[PDB]
Every structure is written in C-alpha cells, then in structure tokens.
Amino acid sequence: VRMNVLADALKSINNAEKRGKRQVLIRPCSKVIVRFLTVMMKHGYIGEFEIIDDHRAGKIVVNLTGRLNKCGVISPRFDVQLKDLEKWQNNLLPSRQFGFIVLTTSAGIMDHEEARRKHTGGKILGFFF
Amino acid sequence: ADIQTERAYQKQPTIFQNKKRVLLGETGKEKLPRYYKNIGLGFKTPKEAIEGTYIDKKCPFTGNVSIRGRILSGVVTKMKMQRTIVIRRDYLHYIRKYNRFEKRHKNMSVHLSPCFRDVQIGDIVTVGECRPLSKTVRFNVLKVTKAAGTK
Amino acid sequence: GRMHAPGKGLSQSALPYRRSVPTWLKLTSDDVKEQIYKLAKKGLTPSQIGVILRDSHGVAQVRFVTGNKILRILKSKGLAPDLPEDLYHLIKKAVAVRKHLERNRKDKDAKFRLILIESRIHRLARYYKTKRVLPPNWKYESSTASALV
Amino acid sequence: GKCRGLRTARKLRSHRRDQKWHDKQYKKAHLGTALKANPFGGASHAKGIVLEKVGVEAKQPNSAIRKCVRVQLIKNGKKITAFVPNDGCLNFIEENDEVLVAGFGRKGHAVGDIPGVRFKVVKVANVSLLALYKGKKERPR
Amino acid sequence: ARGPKKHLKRVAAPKHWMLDKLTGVFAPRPSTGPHKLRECLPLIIFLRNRLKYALTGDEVKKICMQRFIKIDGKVRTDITYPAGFMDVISIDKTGENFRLIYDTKGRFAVHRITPEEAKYKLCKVRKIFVGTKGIPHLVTHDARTIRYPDPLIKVNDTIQIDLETGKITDFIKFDTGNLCMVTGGANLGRIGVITNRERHPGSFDVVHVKDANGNSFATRLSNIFVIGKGNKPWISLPRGKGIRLTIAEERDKRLAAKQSSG
RNA sequence: ACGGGGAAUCAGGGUUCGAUUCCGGAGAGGGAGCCUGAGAAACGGCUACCACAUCCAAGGAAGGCAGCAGGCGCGCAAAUU
RNA sequence: UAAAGUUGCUGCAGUUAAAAAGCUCGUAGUUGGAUCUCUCUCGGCCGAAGCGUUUACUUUGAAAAAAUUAGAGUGUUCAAAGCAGGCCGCCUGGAUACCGCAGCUAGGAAUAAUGGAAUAGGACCGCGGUUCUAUUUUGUUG
RNA sequence: GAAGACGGUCGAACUUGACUAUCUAGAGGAAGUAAAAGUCGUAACAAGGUUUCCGUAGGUGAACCUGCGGAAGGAUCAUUA
C-alpha cells in the first residue's frame, strides 16, 4: 500500500521533469503536498499548479518549467535542529549557492534559509534543486 | 465490610476511638472520626478516602507515607497482589549512530490504596514517589484516569 | 492487491461528483427510511437493501437522500443484526467449508482456503473488538460457529 | 531493501551486530579461538629455546632451502618454526640456546615461498641477528 | 572510604580560587565552618594568593598566629578557615577591612570597605523555627542562630547583623523590585532587581532578575541574595556593579584602557 | 570488564581504547569474625581457619610491600635499597 | 584507527561474480491514505487564574567538578608549555564556548500519535427537592 | 568482678564425587592440505566421445554407474495442415 503521499508526488514530478514534460498529474493531493509545491514555486522551480477537487481526495496538475534537477523526499522525517541544518545541507544540496531543504516547523513549512531566519528547527520533509 | 481480617487490630494510629461514652456522650450514634490528609501538588483526596473505612498505612491520603520526589505516569497491566499493582511505562530510547529510536518499557510495582476501586487493566495512573514500601515498591498511586472507552 | 490472493483487480463502484438527490427521485427521506425498515423486516442485510433500492426504487445513494447510511438507520430504528454482515458472511463461508471438509478429508485445497477464511475472520473480529462493535470476550471458535450462522 | 523507520534503531543495531560476525577479521579478533591458537598468545615477540635446525623447501615456483629453526617457547612450551632471515645467520645459531622470535609480517600468515613458517628470529643469545650479521657484536663466550 | 576525607586535590579544588596546576598537588582543604567547602575562600588563599601578604603557607601561618586577622569581628587563627559571602575580614595592623563579595566572573573580589561599613554584614535567613517554650529562632547563611527575630522576617529575606553585638538591626523582604546578588550558578556575581518569581511546588522556584543595564537572567531561589531595598544596595558594590559584560564589550574596554595607558 | 571524566583515529557518520596521577567503587595472600571509636567489618589493628613462611635451647614465639626504595619469580615488557 | 561505500544510519550488495526462505498464512516488531482556520482580595478593559484537551518535535531558560579538547589575553628568547604579567607604589588577567541521553522550565503549534456527543447516564441554561455547613445572637453559651 | 560451662548466631575449616586442564597412556579410527601422480585409469571442460547438473535411493578399485522426478547453466529461442 502507499505511505508518504508526498514521496509519490515528488517522484512523479521528478520523473515527469526528467522526460521533459510540461505538466504532471499528482494524486492524491494533500496539505503537505500543496505547501511543499508552494515552496518550490516561490523559488521559481515549478510554476503554477491547479488543484482538481474531487469529493474524495484532490489531484494536482503541476506546470513544469524545466528548472528542476531533483525534487526528493527524506524518509523518515528526522527531527532537525538548527545545528544539524548545516550537515543536512552539506549532505543533500549540490552547492551552497542554490538548492533548498524543506522543513516542517511549528511556524509552517519552509525552506532551510527561512528556518534559519526565524531561528527554528523541525522535521525534514525533502529537498529540491 | 469487616476491616478486621488480620491477626492484629487494624486502626488509624492517630485516631482515638474509645473516648469515654456516657448518656450525653451517646445519642443514637457511636461516631468514628476518619484521619485523612491533603497531599500536595494539587492532588485532591478521593471521596472514598474521606468517607471510607479501610485501614491502609501505605495509603497516601489516610496512611503514613509522604509523597516527595518524582511524579510519574503509567498504564495498569497487572492487578493481582494485595493493594499493589504492576504498571508499565513505555518510552523511546534514542540510538545516536542510527539517529533513530527503539521501544523500551519498564514495569513498576506501585501501591494502590483501597480508595481506588474500579481500576482496570489499561487504566492510566499518576503515581508519586515515596519511601520504600516493600522490596520493590517505591511509588504510590495518586490519581487514576480511565482508559478511553468509558460509556 | 487482494489481501489473500495475487489478484490486482480494479473493479469497484465510482461515485458521481454530485452529492445531491437526483431530480427524477421523488421519494422523501422518510419514504426511503420506511422502505429500508420494510426491507430489513423482510430479513435483508444492508448491502441487499441498498442494492434493491438502487435497482428498483431508483435510490442512487441512501446517504444522499436521508443524510444517513443504511446500517446507521437500521441501528437507530433498533433492527440492526447482532454482528456485522461482513463478519457474518465470513463465518458462514467458514462453516460451509468446514462442513465440506468433514466429509472430504483429502481436500488440501479446502483446508488451505479454510485457513485463509479464518484468518480473514480473525482480522475482522479484532478490528470490530477495537471499535467496541463486538464484546471484548467475543471469540470465533470452530465448534459451534454454525449457531452463529 | 532495508528498514527506514524512526523506531527501527533496535532492528538496525541488532542486524549490524549479527552481520558483523560474518566479517572474517572481526570474528577472528572477537571469537577468542585465534588468540588461543596463537603460539605467542597475543604477544608481539616471544623467547624460545632452539630444538634443532630445520631446512624448509621453498614453494614450487621458486627453488631454495630456507634455513629455519624449530624453537620451543618458554612461556607456554609450544613448538614453532622460525625463519633465520639473512645469509650465514644459521651459523650464528647453535642448538639449545635462547632466541627472540617475532612475527613474519603478515599477522599470522605465511610470507613468500616459506610454507607453514610465520615467525622470524630477531635475537640469538641476547644478541640481535643484525648486529652479528654486520659484525657490530659477537655472540657471548 | 572510611570516615571523613581530610585532603583536597589542587585540580579538584573550587575553580574560583584561581589556583595553579603546578604549585603542588594539594589545595588547602577548608576547615568545617559557617560556609560550604565549594562556596568559601580559605584564609590562606586570601592572605597569600589574593593580597600577596605572604609568599608561602608558613607566612600565612605566622600572620594568622600573630592574631592579626579578624573575621566578622572575631580573631581567627585557622589558616584554612572557610570565609564566604558577605563576610568581613579586618586587618587592624594595616588598618584595612575587606568584604567577601563576588565578581561578575563568579570569583571573590578584593573589595575594600570603610571601617564604619565593617561594623555590620548582611545574612540571608535560611530558616525560621520556633523552639523550647515558643522562642522563635532564625538560621542564616552563616550558620548563625539568632533568637527572637522580628516576626516579619521570613525565609529568603535578608537581615543586617551588627557584628559587635550579633543582633538584628534591619531587614529586607524578598519581593519584586528589590536588589539582589546571585550567589550560585551561571549568573553568579550578577546584581539586579527582582522582577518575577515562578513558584514550582515540590521543586525549585525560579527567580528572574533584571540588570541595571536592561539585561535579564534567571536563577534558582536558593541562588538569590537580597542585597538592598529597592534598587539601592545596603553595601558597597565592587568595581563592576554586577553588570556582566559580554566578551566583546570586555575586549573593547581592554583596548580602550590599553590606548589610554599604552 | 573496575565505572566515568577522558584517549587515538576520524570530511560528514563512525571505529577502537580508557590498569594509569581527577571523581566514584573495591581490596590489602584467601575466606570469616570482631574490638576501639564520631567514623573500620581497618589489616603499616586484633581473633581463627586455609596456603605460604621466619626464629627456637622444641617448651614456645612471631608474620602479611596491590606504601617508598630494593630482591626473586614471571615474562616481549618497566628506574635509586 | 583511517584507507573500508570490503559491515554501508549517512552508504554496500543479493538474475549470471557470495547471496531471495519451496510456497502461503500468521502474533509481536516496523510502517501506515484524504480530511478539522474576555472569569478568583488590586491604590498601573488596570496585579490574575488555569481546573481546561496529553505527549513527541523545535526554540528558550535554569542546573550541570576541575583537568583534557575548542577558544580569549599574555614575546617561555621562540615553541611544546605556563597562568602569568604590565608601567613609573600603580594598572590588569586568571575569559568564553561545548557538556550528548534522561530529569526540570517556558514560548511555537506545522508534522506525527492521541481524546470527546451515537442506547446520549452530551454541552449551556434556569427550576423540584439535603446536610455541624470553623458563626447566620459583645446577651452567661441555650 | 577473671577463668570456665549450656544454649544461640555468624561462620572460616583435609567437604569421603560428574576431573571444560594444552599436557600425555595412544599403538588407535576416519577425514583436510602443497603429490618426481610414483601407479592405475580418464569422471568433467568440444555432442569431452553415454549432453551436463540438482534432489533421492541402491551399487562400485577409483574417478563414478544406474533408477525416479527435475533444470538448461544445452547441443533446440524455430519445423510449417
């Protein structure tokens, strides 16, 4: 059975972007998926997306702009402190110039730079670059 | 019920129960005062402790035990001794190399006063640390919260 | 995939997006409730009641007309069966397989299928005990389970 | 695949601990059979008494007589065979005299074309074989 | 070990004594006395290491056995006498008086006081109890017992003892807005106004203190010592007034002092 | 296998070590039992047994270096009576 | 010990090189789909209480021997070190960080677990019914 | 108020029981490894001259042979209405 719908969504986006497609369908949608996608889009990595509302669990059509190299999930959601963030960045990101680690913190879902700005830690959801 | 099921007389040591009775001293009632105390930390004395008749010298409310130290919680797993139960504390231990956890548990033999009737398996008990009461008992049941499923 | 088979079938119902009562359907919610009561008094399980209401009376979904599900209506009126119908049918199938195996002792396939059926029975019974639908002392024993049938 | 759960630490640690025993070097170090079987008993060197001079044939691709000595270790009375490394150095060793022997350099494995020999003589009669070989010292009289 | 220990190792000694790691194996094990082992300053450390009046422990012994040192107005000849917080050390031969008061770094300072200030001291009352025909008694942080205290003095308050008579003269209640030193923990030596007290029944109460410079910190209630009523201390404060500077500000002050001096 | 502080190595993880001067525990050849004392089941205290062992006029007496040096033994392995 | 990503948590392999149980069921273990955005004595709506729904997480604050490690100052002739020293009696240091897990504390409320109302012995609201109720008798209590 | 005695208790002690200890009394029995393979064959690698191999069972100087079921890692990805 499927656990971690966010893992499925991120793998689908990755597989579609590697084939050079312009849109990708994601099912099921969820709040965490929508927040992760919003974080990706605010940095110009995906583009606009539409939430198709069926009465069971929505779908998302994500417009792809080919600026994405890898969007991935980190399972399990390890708790990350502000000290461990540098080690996680070294492990996951391809460079200190770009790439983002997405965390879920009590202040919301945000990239690692925004988590350093608010001086907060949390649980690692995934990464994208 | 008869509270005298032992080879010795059971009584609250701080209560004098044979103060002299006369015609004025008895008007249709013998009367028997009940020693109870309010333990600290916001715990309220159960009604059965105040208006009961049991004799338990290890009871936190009517006995001779001072609640000081750790105040822990557990889940009742065995009720098969006299005035003592076995609770299970479940926790997660962090292994650092794998950055992960493992389930661990510890059993705790804790004293349960006769003031807590209708305590079941699966009930949550808040226990307080006291002096050693037996070879293994060091905690007294202060509060009982029933498991989800009361109807 | 199936819990006890290598099958990966997809066949299932597909509810329409609209949750409203059909325009053709003129039965009031109380009318559907009385039809449900009549069918239950006839001796039918909620699945059968729903099938009959869909096929003959045009009730596409009872939940959308009455705002309630068939089993909930039967319980609220007080004429729901003692044990849930899925568990009942699983026990009935197990009883049938055991009756067949009594007179056919060389059927290893029947023994294997009985093992699968009783595993399904136990899983469903544990779930029902968790939900307080069955008493906590309820147990499926294969000695007089035909009485439960 | 392997388990990835926040509560799998016991599973991961236990599986690693069981699978470490299939490591030949780890098992050799932690089982205790190799230490028992080791004639030196965990020591780097050992003193022994030369029982006889033995000539060991080099393995088949090569051809020579490796001049070794059988020695009996004082610590445990075990009998080992130790190479006398350089040339003419077998003439520096007599019978029934004390020699310091060390490993041959492979941590208990035979070296080169010398079958079943894993020790080498370092000293004879409390004088190093290097000193006698270079003429810096002479064996005591 | 059987029975009490009688030695203190040099490296295991309290850090605030500021002892070397090469001038011997042992540190002076302070004698039993009014102050705890780890919260005191032995007389030998004060006379030799602090004031440089002696170069050896033998010279400290000579000074103390000439009956020149008074501690709280009484002559002490014990070179390992535990002197501690708020104590008064009088040397009448040289005509000086010192008070044992913490620096912001948590170390007893060489804080000279006037001969008229050396007539009193401040003591935090550790307990109050009624005994033996209802006579109230009070026990302070100097382990000194005072009979018939004011019925308004409670635990955690501060009382001004006259050293000549030993009697209480005045007292400060433990209340918000009162000045206090911190006598233990990370904030040891800091001075500030009590702003809040969080009561934790069955555990340690936590007292919040605000510095004179707007800095705030917290300690355990046992680490608070009421110094003055309001924001005015009843004793003379050391050079730093209880203001703990960060390392950057201390470096800046040191550089300014170097510029002014050379 | 005395425990810890800690040590070696190490990109991030980790691996191995910690008898050893600081803290805590234990022991004084092995067991056991005590006296005195605030504090010892103390051994540079006593009592006995087991092992070892010293002097003797054979009646008896005396012993405990895992304190500092030093000796023997052991060993690959460690200093001045 | 590193090299050894040849013990692989990061991070290894398992068709043929060493390797997936003959095959299913199955308890523990592990992992689990979507979904819920102005309340107690006051002399500053102006001191306060929680009596209410628990934790994990994260941030913070206490408390936490020294020595060692990191690290500030300081020409040991330099350095390893040391905790000294500097100026013409005086001036100045003897810092600071880290101290994991567990325990304590206070903000946040995403993520994850968890809870109530379904025979209503459910929430709020006013009514029918009981008590020495530390005073509802400056007067000797009754 | 000393010696002494009954009893108690703690309790070391030549307690009349299973010697995990390499060492030897071992001639012993059957197995692993570099063999001038010395001798005797040629089981496998080519259809290896009876295709090979797996499990099981019997038989044999010896490699092995044979029966039953299986695999291709075969010497057939194929054989015609």
Coordinates of N, CA, C and O (backbone and C1' of nucleotides) in Angstrom, one line a residue, chain C residues 3-4 75 112 115-116 119-120 123 126 132, chain G residues 23-28 115-116 118-120:
Chain C
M3 N -6.1 -9.2 -0.3 CA -5.4 -9.5 0.9 C -5.0 -10.9 0.9 O -3.9 -11.2 1.5
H4 N -5.7 -11.8 0.3 CA -5.4 -13.3 0.3 C -5.3 -13.9 -1.1 O -5.6 -15.0 -1.3
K75 N -29.7 0.6 12.9 CA -29.3 0.7 14.3 C -30.2 1.7 15.0 O -30.7 1.4 16.1
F112 N -6.6 -25.3 3.0 CA -5.9 -24.0 2.7 C -6.9 -22.8 2.6 O -6.6 -21.8 3.2
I115 N -8.1 -22.0 6.1 CA -7.1 -21.2 6.8 C -7.2 -19.7 6.4 O -7.2 -18.8 7.3
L116 N -7.3 -19.5 5.1 CA -7.4 -18.1 4.6 C -8.7 -17.4 5.2 O -8.7 -16.3 5.7
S119 N -8.4 -16.7 8.9 CA -7.5 -15.5 9.1 C -8.3 -14.2 8.8 O -8.1 -13.3 9.6
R120 N -9.0 -14.2 7.8 CA -9.9 -13.0 7.5 C -10.9 -12.8 8.6 O -11.1 -11.6 9.0
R123 N -9.0 -11.3 11.6 CA -8.7 -9.9 11.4 C -9.9 -9.0 11.6 O -9.8 -7.9 12.3
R126 N -11.0 -8.8 15.3 CA -10.1 -7.9 16.1 C -10.4 -6.5 15.8 O -10.5 -5.7 16.7
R132 N -15.3 -1.6 19.6 CA -16.4 -1.9 20.6 C -17.7 -2.3 19.9 O -18.8 -2.1 20.4
Chain G
rC23 P 9.9 -19.5 -2.3 O5' 8.3 -19.7 -2.1 C5' 7.5 -20.1 -3.3 C4' 6.2 -20.5 -2.8 C3' 5.5 -19.6 -1.9 O3' 4.9 -18.5 -2.6 C1' 5.3 -21.7 -1.0
rU24 P 4.6 -17.1 -1.8 O5' 3.0 -17.2 -1.6 C5' 2.3 -16.6 -0.5 C4' 1.3 -17.5 0.1 C3' 0.8 -17.0 1.5 O3' -0.2 -16.1 1.4 C1' 1.4 -19.3 1.6
rC25 P -0.1 -14.7 2.2 O5' -0.7 -15.1 3.6 C5' -2.0 -15.8 3.7 C4' -2.2 -16.6 4.9 C3' -1.9 -15.8 6.2 O3' -3.1 -15.0 6.6 C1' -0.9 -17.9 6.3
rG26 P -2.9 -13.5 7.1 O5' -2.2 -13.7 8.6 C5' -2.9 -14.4 9.6 C4' -1.9 -14.8 10.6 C3' -1.1 -13.7 11.3 O3' -1.8 -13.1 12.3 C1' 0.3 -15.5 10.7
rU27 P -1.8 -11.5 12.5 O5' -1.1 -11.3 14.0 C5' -1.8 -11.9 15.1 C4' -0.8 -12.0 16.2 C3' 0.1 -10.8 16.5 O3' -0.5 -9.8 17.2 C1' 1.4 -12.8 16.6
rA28 P 0.0 -8.2 16.9 O5' 1.4 -8.2 17.5 C5' 1.7 -8.2 18.9 C4' 3.1 -8.4 19.2 C3' 4.1 -7.3 18.8 O3' 4.1 -6.2 19.7 C1' 5.0 -9.4 18.2
rG115 P -7.8 7.9 20.6 O5' -8.7 9.0 21.5 C5' -8.8 8.9 22.9 C4' -9.4 10.2 23.5 C3' -10.6 10.7 22.9 O3' -11.8 10.1 23.5 C1' -9.1 12.4 23.1
rG116 P -13.0 9.5 22.6 O5' -14.2 10.4 23.1 C5' -14.5 10.5 24.5 C4' -14.9 11.9 24.9 C3' -16.3 12.3 24.4 O3' -16.9 13.3 25.4 C1' -14.7 13.7 23.4
rA118 P -22.0 9.4 23.0 O5' -22.7 8.6 21.9 C5' -24.1 8.2 22.1 C4' -24.5 7.3 20.9 C3' -23.5 6.3 20.3 O3' -24.2 5.1 19.9 C1' -24.3 7.8 18.6
rU119 P -24.3 3.9 20.9 O5' -25.9 3.8 21.1 C5' -26.6 4.7 21.9 C4' -28.1 4.4 22.0 C3' -28.9 5.2 22.9 O3' -30.2 5.4 22.4 C1' -29.0 3.0 23.7
rA120 P -31.0 6.8 22.5 O5' -29.8 7.9 22.2 C5' -29.6 9.0 23.1 C4' -28.4 8.7 24.0 C3' -28.7 9.1 25.5 O3' -28.0 8.3 26.4 C1' -26.8 10.3 24.6

